[PDB]
Structure formats: C-alpha cells, structure tokens
Amino acid sequence: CQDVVQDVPNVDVQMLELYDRMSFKDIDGGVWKQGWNIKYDPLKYNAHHKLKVFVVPHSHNDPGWIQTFEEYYQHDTKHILSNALRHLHDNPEMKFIWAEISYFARFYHDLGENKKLQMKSIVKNGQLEFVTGGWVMPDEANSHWRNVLLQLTEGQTWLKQFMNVTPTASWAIDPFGHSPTMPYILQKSGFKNMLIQRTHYSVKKELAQQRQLEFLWRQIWDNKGDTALFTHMMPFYSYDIPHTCGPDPKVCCQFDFKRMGSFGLSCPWKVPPRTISDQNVAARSDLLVDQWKKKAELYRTNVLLIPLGDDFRFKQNTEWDVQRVNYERLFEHINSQAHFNVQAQFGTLQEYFDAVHQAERAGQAEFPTLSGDFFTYADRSDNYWSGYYTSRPYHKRMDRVLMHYVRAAEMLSAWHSWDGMARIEERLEQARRELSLFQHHDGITGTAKTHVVVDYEQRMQEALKACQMVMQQSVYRLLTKPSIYSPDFSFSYFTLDDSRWPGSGVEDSRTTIILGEDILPSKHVVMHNTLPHWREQLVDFYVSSPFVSVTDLANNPVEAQVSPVWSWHHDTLTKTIHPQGSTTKYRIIFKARVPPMGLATYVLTISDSKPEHTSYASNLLLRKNPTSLPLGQYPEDVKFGDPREISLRVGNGPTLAFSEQGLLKSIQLTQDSPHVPVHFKFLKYGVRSHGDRSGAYLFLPNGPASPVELGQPVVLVTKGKLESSVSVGLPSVVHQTIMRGGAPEIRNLVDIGSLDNTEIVMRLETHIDSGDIFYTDLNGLQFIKRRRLDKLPLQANYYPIPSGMFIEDANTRLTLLTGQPLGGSSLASGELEIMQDRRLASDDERGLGQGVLDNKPVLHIYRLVLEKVNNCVRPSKLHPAGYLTSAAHKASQSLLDPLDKFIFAENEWIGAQGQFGGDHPSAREDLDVSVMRRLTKSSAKTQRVGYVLHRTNLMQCGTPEEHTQKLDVCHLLPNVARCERTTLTFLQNLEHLDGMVAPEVCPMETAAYVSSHS
C-alpha cells in the first residue's frame, strides 16, 4: 500500500501552490476578455503536419432547472432526441454526443421497437455517443462521493443493458467548479479521459499560457500516479458556440447558425451569422480557421476539440439542417484548400481523445501532471459561486438522509432473494433514481426555480417511503423464525423512527409508542447498524408514559433515561422564543449495541411507578419572568433561575461551559486540563446596495458579518445520566448542544423567516494558532488543505463543507463534522464558520430568474471534536492533504450513517428473534462497506451480490490498535462459487480471486467485488 501521509507527490501543477503564486488580476485581455491576443505562426501546420479539427455537436439538457424534469422532457428533450434519431439516421456523417441518461432512458422506453432498433444502430455505428453515461451530470461541490457513484452506476447499468456500451470518456461542462473526486471514481470505473469547463477565469489564463489545459489529474496524496486520469479543461468563458470556436466571441457567434432570426436568437456582439455560399465561403473560412488556429495554440497536439452546442439545442429539424449544411460547406472548402493545412470534420468526444493519445504515443506531446481541485469558481470579476454551497439547505440535508436510507434499504434486502411479488427491486430502483436525479447540478445545489425544488422534494419523499417499505419488510424476514414468517408484502410490520429528520420543530412525524395497563404492556423495537463493526449508540423513542423500562430479548435490563419532550415556540403574544413540555409524551433513551451490518431487538415495558433501571433527567429553565412548566407524570419538577453561566459533564467525557446566553464558551477535555476557549457565535451577512447582488449561485457580501443581536434568550438545560443538553431560542435559530459522553452533538433548528437579504452564519472562535490554513472535505471522501488568501475577496475564501472542516496548530485541533453540505471558511486564525441558510430577494444574473425566498425550517446537525494532536503523525508542511483522527471519523459516521430504528406496528410479534449478524466480522474502524447490493433477481440460477469497500486513512496518534477481524465480503453470504474484483459500477470483471476471497483495500482506496452463489 502507498503511504498517503509521509510522501509529498511531485507534480507539475499543485493547485494550492499555484493559488499561492497567482495574482488573479482581472485585466481586459481584448476580444478574449479574460485572456490575451493569441498569436500563432502560420508555418506551424503544413502538408506534412495538419491541424485535425473535430467539431462535436452537443445539447446540454438539465434534468430540472427552470422547468421540472418532466416539463423539459415534454417541451424540449423528447423532440431533441426524436430529431437526433431521424437526422443521424438520414445523414451518416453527422455526429452527436449525449450525457444525461435519466432523459435518454425516459425517451427510449417510450419508443416503438422499430425506432429502438434504429437508435441502437446509430449508437453501435458511432454516430451517437454517450459521454460519462451517468443518470445526470452531477454537482461536484455538495454531492457525497457515494451518490456520485450511485448515479454513475444507475446510468451506466442502463446503458450496458439497453445500448450495449460503457462510456470511457466523461463530459462535465456545467458543474460550478470541479472536484478530484470525479477522476477518482471515474478511473476506478474504467474511464480513460475526462473533460471539464467551469474553472476560475484566472486559472484558465494561467494554465493556457503554459499549455497545461490538458493534464494527468491524480489525487493529492498519490505519490506514484496510479490514480491519474487524462483531463481536458476547456479554455474559455462558456461551453456555448460563441466561446468554443476560438478566443473572439464576436467571430464565433457568426458560426452558430441558429442565430440568424427565425429561431428567436441573435448575437449580442451585433454581427449575425450569414448562410455559407460559394461567394462568401472563402472569407468565412479565413475567419473560422484563424479562430481555430488561435485556440490550437493553447494545447500541445495537432488535434483540436471544437464543441458545437448549447442548452437544449438540436430541437427543431430546421436547426439540425442549418447547422449541418453550413458546417459541411465550410469543411468542403477548408479541407480542399491546402494553404490552411487543416482537416475538419464532425466527431465525437472519444474520437478526439483517441486522436490526442495517438499523437502522444507518436511522441508529439507529453502532458503535465496535476493535483488539487477547482473550487471556488468565479466566471467573471469578483462573482464567486460560493452561494450554492448553502442554497436550499433543507434539501441539502434531505440528500444526506436519503443517501443513508438507500444504502440501508439495499443492504437489508440484499441478504435474501425476494419473490417478484414483494416489489423490492421496483422500490429500490425508484429510490436510487430519485436520489440520483437530485445529484444534478441544479438539484442539490439549490439553484432551481421554486416549483422545481418542490418536484425534487416530492420525488425524494417518495424515495424515502420506498426505502422504508423495503427496510421494514427485510427486518421482519431477518428476525422472524422462518417457519412462522408469513409476509404480506403490502403490510407495515414496522415503522421507522427518525429523531433527526425532518426533525423536532420541522415536522411532527414520529409516532409515540402507546403503552398502558388497559391497552398494551410492551413494545418491541429493532435497531439496524449498516457499518461493518459492532457499534453502540444512544437511541431515543417517544412513549406515552414516563414509567418505562428497557430489556434486551434475553430479558436483561438495559439502563435507560427518560426526559421530557420539549418543543420551542415563537410566541407572537409575549414576543419570546420559549419551550413547552408535553404532559403526555416522553422520551426514553438507552444505549443500543448492534452487530456489524446487523440488527438488535429490545423491548420497552410500562410499569405503574419508577422502574429500577430507568433514571429521569432534571430540567432547568433560565430566563427572567418564568412561568410554570408542568410535565404530567414526569417525576422531577422543572427548576427555574435567572440566566447564568453553566457547566456540564456527562460520564467521563469533556466538561463544557456555556455563557448566560446558552452558547458554548469552553471545553475541558479531562479533570485537570485547561478550559480551552471554544465559543459559538451567530452572525449575519447582508447584500450590496449597489453593484452585483447575491443570489442562488453567488455570494457577494456587503463586508464581514455582523453579530445577531440576541436579546436575553431563554435557555433550557436538561441534565441526565446518559444525555444532557443546553438549548437556547435565538433569533432564527434554536441552537442545541447535546452531550452523551464524548464529543458534543450540535443541532440548529434554523428558520430564517422573513429576513430578506440575510445569510446566517455559525462561527466558532478559538485561540488555536492556525494562521491562514484550514481543511475542508471533498465529497465526503478526502480532506484538502486550504489557505485563506487576503488577495481574494471574502466570498472566494468560502469552500464547500460537504461533511467536515478543521483547523489546527502544533498542539490542538478543532474539527466540525456536518450532517449536510453547507458553505464555510476560516476567515481569521483560530476561527471556523459555516453558513446555515440564506434568503435573497434578487436574481444573480445566471438565468434562474428569481431570488431565494422559499426558505423553510431545517434541522442542521453536527459533531464538534476538540483534540490534542501533538502526538499525531501528520503530513509534512508541504503535503496538500489532511486526515481525520479516529474520533472525528466515528463522529462523522454517527451523523451520516446512524443506527436505524424500527417500531413493531402490531401488538404481538410472533416468532421474534433477538439479533441478526452476530457472526458478521467486525472490521477495522477505517474500513466501510459503502454499498452492498444484490445484482440479480430471484429467477437467476447464479445469484450475484456486489460490494463497494472503502478504506479511509486515520491519523496514528498513539492509541494501540487492538482486535478486529478480517472482512472478506465474498463470504458474507453462503454457498459462494466465485468472487471477482470489478469496476465500481459492477459492470466489468477485472480479476478472478483465488479462494473466492476478497481482499481488503489500502488506505484511501475503494474497490468493488461481486460474489456469485449457487
């Protein structure tokens, strides 16, 4: 295994180092506004060395943006695909590339058999070529790598089954900045090449000057280069025709033949295209070839890529004709005029890359190596696209909830083969496709119109219901004696209980377990643990009495804590935000211990008085002018006091101190240690009153944030043996710090209300001497070093926080893990900050045509880990990566993949068993079974199950290793007949494994395996 910590890779271009050296000046470059006047030597190409030009027709089809997926399909995409089929069928030399398989599958399934056969023929013959082949072209900033892989697999599995092709070239022309997680996944999925477009204009200028727009993109920790993927970065401001033929858009616009008038389009540079004729073709070719030769100067081979397309293009038959015929007249002239020394033709993306590599193998070019990312993007001036790291945060959080539900449903149902009548494959395909759709770069990014966001939300709600159905049917089968198991596949044997989604204060969605002497004495509950190691976690349920005790199925008592159910209300009469307690529902909390990838059953029983093994939390309301808070049968009366500082400690965990406003002020790790200053603060950013306005995409603050005025907020303190917490009702946020014995959990119920042109940020202030360095993750896969640059504006220093961020000095680190992707930064030494929500009245001029005024309450979740790191073996000062500690990684897993909780719905569960998975190996803590998916339906004689195994890399800080068993996923199911290592999409077998054993993977590596069973 390569060492991912101690060896700094030697690359030609390292983006953090490049950023430190670049000046980012926004100077007027002439017709190429963000470049320079390109010069070329006419003698470079000649009879023996021609410029080969591939014009690649394309149509960018967003799966929802300004219209829903179905609206665009009916109004635009079905016509584009129908006319592409007709035009390509009738014109053998014409080509076209297609990226979004969600639309292609929606079209293909509605085609009659004759047309399906025609479509297969134009794909098999190379006229229509799929690029990437994912369900969507995903966002790369907020998306979790697991979902990037899910959507890639959904599209490529469809293509392999119906079109018999698997793309090896990727096309990503629209995500708003680019992540190295893409080449990581693509290279492990059989890809050989990829293309990107939206990178900072200063980066395009810098790389173009050095002819470094094509590079071998490797991961930041990869010393050897085995992760490298050839990448082509486009050079110009857009993927539209005016910015793809060459440097001067006023010229290139004249070669978009859809802009002459009858189509409702024109050239903003005020010179229109003119139909090519024998009388103007020589002058028109002179102009076009000059643009091509200038673009070719920015690259190293004699093969040039000229994309020809835009949003929802190639819709009308007349458009296909006007583009094709005019370009064919130009090719016939150009290719017959020896003085140009050019051979131009329509081509596909793969044809371009194959020709580039032929040139490379002939020794005509060598390419530079590069590591790093391409965030934060700016397309012009100071317009940095860091707003979408937070926009529509409710749906960003929903993404992570559904991510976990899809994994748990696929894993729980994989253990058995299911009859078709159970509809398991049907529900899982629906859930995978809705979650995959939301990965679109106008989905999770929060950049779609309001009614489109509603459509994505409704699709994800249906997907969550599908996952619940599959999970509860699977639990009933896994934990019932087989000769008693009697399923009705439409029945709800269990209901899921989720304490953090939608969340208290967001939706009253949780069911209360109703117990009573005259109705039902007890109730079975079951926890599922999707992670491959034994895990304990506190779990809570609502119950109708405070006198409840817990037992396991061997009837052993389990220690439990009962607390009240508190709900916060913005009281419009008293004008205060304060909590109300229930006098008939209570929370019972206990530690569940669950096997690796397994299940554990417990029983909740009512008694007429306080049970021996259940304790009750005390509650203290700190506020001036208190009023009583009765809690029914709850045995401890609520206490009151004026606001004051308070300190709490659960178990042997840290001691946390809080200000009189209910906000953390310090953390003391052990009995003797210092109370380390760590303070939470909420602030607000505004919008500029002149100049460019923030919107869904852009963050354009009117200066540093201002503190939210807190008034004298009401603070609720709950102190229990198993769980304690401090909650405070602040303007727009009920902020809660929860302690269970380790790093605290933070929950914010964020309701920005009607505060227009406001972005609410949560900041942590410490005295850690971090300087200008901080770390943020990329897609939940890796942590990258960031350097705050005071030569760039505030919004350029914001980065995506898809799952966590940290600051550190020689001795101390503070890590904030998140349960949802949000934007954040470290704007000063010792600080971390993360945006909670943003409400913006204005459109930001990127085509959305609206502000962001559809905010709704969202419950954000976090874990806050303060640690000593002076003993940790960390990368050297020049290494571009960082790595979590064991505690921080476990805290992130507690947010993203918590235990699932199931409540038995009927009165009696006949044949119930106490546990499933007790014999499953408990793997080392850095290893995860990211995906477990049965790949065959029940009629297949040879069943196949796919696994994606990922090992992260955790710092070595002095804790002895201990235990753990080797995990061989190929032997998790019985009767294994074969084990194969495959691409990550499961579509190609790469290695037949000796002894049917699937080896574990190295740190930072991900592998896929398929076991076959007879």
Ligand SMILES: [O-]S([O-])([O-])O[C@@H](CO)[C@H](O)C[S@+]1C[C@@H](O)[C@H](O)[C@H]1CO
């Ligand atoms: O013409 S528009 O639609 O206003 O904007 C463009 C060219 O002007 C963009 O390239 C359309 S892209 C399409 C959509 O996926 C992105 O949200 C948009 C960000 O701007």
Ligand SMILES: *[C@@H]1O[C@H](CO)[C@@H](O)[C@H](O)[C@H]1NC(C)=O
């Ligand atoms: C699928 O494509 C392969 C080549 O990639 C070809 O040999 C095969 O016949 C095609 N159809 C089948 C058999 O699946």
Ligand SMILES: [Zn+2]
């Ligand atoms: Zn797009």
